[PDB]
Amino acid sequence: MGGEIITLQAGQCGNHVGKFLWSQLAKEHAIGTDGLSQLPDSSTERDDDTKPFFRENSRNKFTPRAIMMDSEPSVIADVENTFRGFFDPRNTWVASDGASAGNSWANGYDIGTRNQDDILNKIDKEIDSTDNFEGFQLLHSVAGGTGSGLGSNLLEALCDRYPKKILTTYSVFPARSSEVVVQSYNTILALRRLIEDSDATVVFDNASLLNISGKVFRNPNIDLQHTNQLISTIISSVTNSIRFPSYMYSSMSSIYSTLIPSPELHFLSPSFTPFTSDAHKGHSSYDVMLDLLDPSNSLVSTAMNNPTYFNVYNTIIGNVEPRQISRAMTKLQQRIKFPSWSSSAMHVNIGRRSPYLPLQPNENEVSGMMLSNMSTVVNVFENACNTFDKVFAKGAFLNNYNVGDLFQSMQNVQDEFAESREVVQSLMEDYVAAEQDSYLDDVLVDD
Amino acid sequence: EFSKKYHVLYQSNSYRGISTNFFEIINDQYSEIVNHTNQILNQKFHYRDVVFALKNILLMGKSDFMDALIEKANDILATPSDSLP
Numbered sequence: 001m002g003g004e005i006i007t008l009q010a011g012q013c014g015n016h017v018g019k020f021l022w023s024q025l026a027k028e029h030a031i032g033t034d035g036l037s038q039l040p041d042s043s044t045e046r047d048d049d050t051k052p053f054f055r056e057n058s059r060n061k062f063t064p065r066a067i068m069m070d071s072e073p074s075v076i077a078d079v080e081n082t083f084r085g086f087f088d089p090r091n092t093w094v095a096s097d098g099a100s101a102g103n104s105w106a107n108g109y110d111i112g113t114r115n116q117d118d119i120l121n122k123i124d125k126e127i128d129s130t131d132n133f134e135g136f137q138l139l140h141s142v143a144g145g146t147g148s149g150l151g152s153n154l155l156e157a158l159c160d161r162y163p164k165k166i167l168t169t170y171s172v173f174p175a176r177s178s179e180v181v182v183q184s185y186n187t188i189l190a191l192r193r194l195i196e197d198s199d200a201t202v203v204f205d206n207a208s209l210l211n212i213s214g215k216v217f218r219n220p221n222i223d224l225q226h227t228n229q230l231i232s233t234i235i236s237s238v239t240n241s242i243r244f245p246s247y248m249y250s251s252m253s254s255i256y257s258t259l260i261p262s263p264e265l266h267f268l269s270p271s272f273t274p275f276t277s278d279a280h281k282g283h284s285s286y287d288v289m290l291d292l293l294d295p296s297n298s299l300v301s302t303a304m305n306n307p308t309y310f311n312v313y314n315t316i317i318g319n320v321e322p323r324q325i326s327r328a329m330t331k332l333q334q335r336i337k338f339p340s341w342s343s344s345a346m347h348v349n350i351g352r353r354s355p356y357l358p359l360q361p362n363e364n365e366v367s368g369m370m371l372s373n374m375s376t377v378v379n380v381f382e383n384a385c386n387t388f389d390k391v392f393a394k395g396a397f398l399n400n401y402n403v404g405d406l407f408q409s410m411q412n413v414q415d416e417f418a419e420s421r422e423v424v425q426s427l428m429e430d431y432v433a434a435e436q437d438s439y440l441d442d443v444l445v446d447d
Numbered sequence: 448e449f450s451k452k453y454h455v456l457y458q459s460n461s462y463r464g465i466s467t468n469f470f471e472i473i474n475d476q477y478s479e480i481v482n483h484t485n486q487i488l489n490q491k492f493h494y495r496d497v498v499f500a501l502k503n504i505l506l507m508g509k510s511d512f513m514d515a516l517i518e519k520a521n522d523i524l525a526t527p528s529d530s531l532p
């Protein structure tokens with residue numbers, strides 16, 4: 001019904017984000033940079049750590065249940081040089097040949113099979129560390145071909161090796177229209193495999209996150225190192241129900257059960273309230289959540305063309321009042337649109353503000369986050385669509401990326417590419433069918 | 448020792464018998480006792496922790512426990528037979 005979770009970084013994007021994640025998690029549980037408890041031990045609070053994410057030793061050191069992979073060994077090292085004792089290097093690995101690393105396609109897809117044993121040895125050793133295992137969570141970028149290729153080979157390998165486990169990822173694509181021409185093969189292929197696993201992902205283009213970081217932090221010079229903070233608050237809060245569990249959610253299996261009824265459409269679009277990751281909204285518990293639906297604070301391309309929702313999940317944290325939020329739920333119900341097919345209950349949990357954070361001067365500074373399954377999420381990587389359409393439709397660049405003796409024949413390259421485009425189109429076919437009411441009659445009226 | 452103190456305080460008012468001063472002692476005695484009692488209930492008998500625990504287990508306040516219990520007990524519960532070991 002739940003179990004332990006091993007996280008994964010694959011490519012430098014997950015290391016830059018990863019240092020923000022680990023820093024915030026360390027604050028959340030008084031872990032420190034060396035991984036050791038920073039608290040006097042009073043032997044109180046059963047949720048003083050999260051068994052699912054850390055391995056606690058005799059020093060009260062919390063070893064992350066995580067594996068770090070990159071193609072750039074200096075990024076792995078710099079995160080290890082930040083987590084100065086916290087992140088244990090035995091689970092890190094670099095997938096690299098300096099010559100292949102600059103080739104986003106070849107680096108990832110060649111290592112995914114060539115180095116499958118190095119990739120798997122860290123993974124299999126950690127999964128076997130426990131009995132009550134639930135799943136994996138990866139930090140990625142479809143643009144990050146290193147991650148696309150090893151991630152794709154793991155998506156398929158882990159589905160086969162561990163048929164009942166949960167395999168997911170958070171994937172950040174750069175908000176760039178022309179820098180994605182060269183990415184036309186690895187980003188579409190990342191999708192070619194992401195669509196194959198119903199647990200796979202929460203997706204974002206960093207478009208609004210970049211603009212958000214430039215308005216909220218006192219730093220208009222928007223960059224990744226000033227935007228990964230926003231990524232950190234949105235991803236850190238996801239597991240609040242695991243880290244500080246209550247009744248409905250304690251695990252990914254539970255979250256899954258209520259958020260993605262259709263294994264086919266697992267791709268989510270995130271948003272958040274002000275946060276303290278790097279913040280005090282000044283509103284009631286119902287107002288802070290209503291703002292989560294406002295696209296101007298969407299973390300991805302903002303305004304959607306009247307998006308149809310298939311399922312919305314929210315978590316509210318702070319002095320939450322069920323009656324106040326009833327105004328919010330009523331109001332959200334009149335903004336969220338759907339066919340009777342997706343007229344599901346919306347699910348909102350209540351999380352907990354960690355006891356190891358600076359005491360909140362006002363408990364009513366309620367924060368929160370939203371994850372939603374919408375038809376217009378396909379617009380998140382529209383920039384990739386623009387360039388892969390130009391490229392794939394022409395049979396452009398077949399093996400001009402030095403395919404690693406896989407599909408070495410140009411037709412075979414085009415056939416792999418065709419499958420990746422079949423996936424792009426089938427993704428929207430399911431999002432459109434999902435907008436139908438008749439979807440329900442197909443297996444209820446008919447036999 | 449507590450009693451000895453109060454015994455003396457009440458004994459010392461035998462000349463008044465039942466009166467205002469007696470009542471004053473009673474009011475204070477009560478407060479001292481209850482305040483005491485409630486420290487030991489929580490400090491020695493873990494009274495609030497017990498209460499929270501009951502909520503957490505019988506009212507199922509914490510589901511990680513219940514999930515762990517059911518899954519480990521899946522064969523126990525699944526087995527239809529009574530007199531399981």
Ligand SMILES: Nc1nc2c(ncn2[C@@H]2O[C@H](COP(=O)(O)OP(=O)(O)O)[C@@H](O)[C@H]2O)c(=O)[nH]1
Pocket residue numbers: 010011012013014015016017070071072104107108141142143144145146147148172173174175206224228231
């Ligand atoms: N948000 C974020 N995006 C990144 C970061 N590093 C790279 N990217 C993005 O990831 C894509 C390229 O992937 P990258 O991880 O650099 O290549 P890889 O090492 O082969 O996996 C592009 O969309 C980049 O904008 C990062 O630290 N944070």
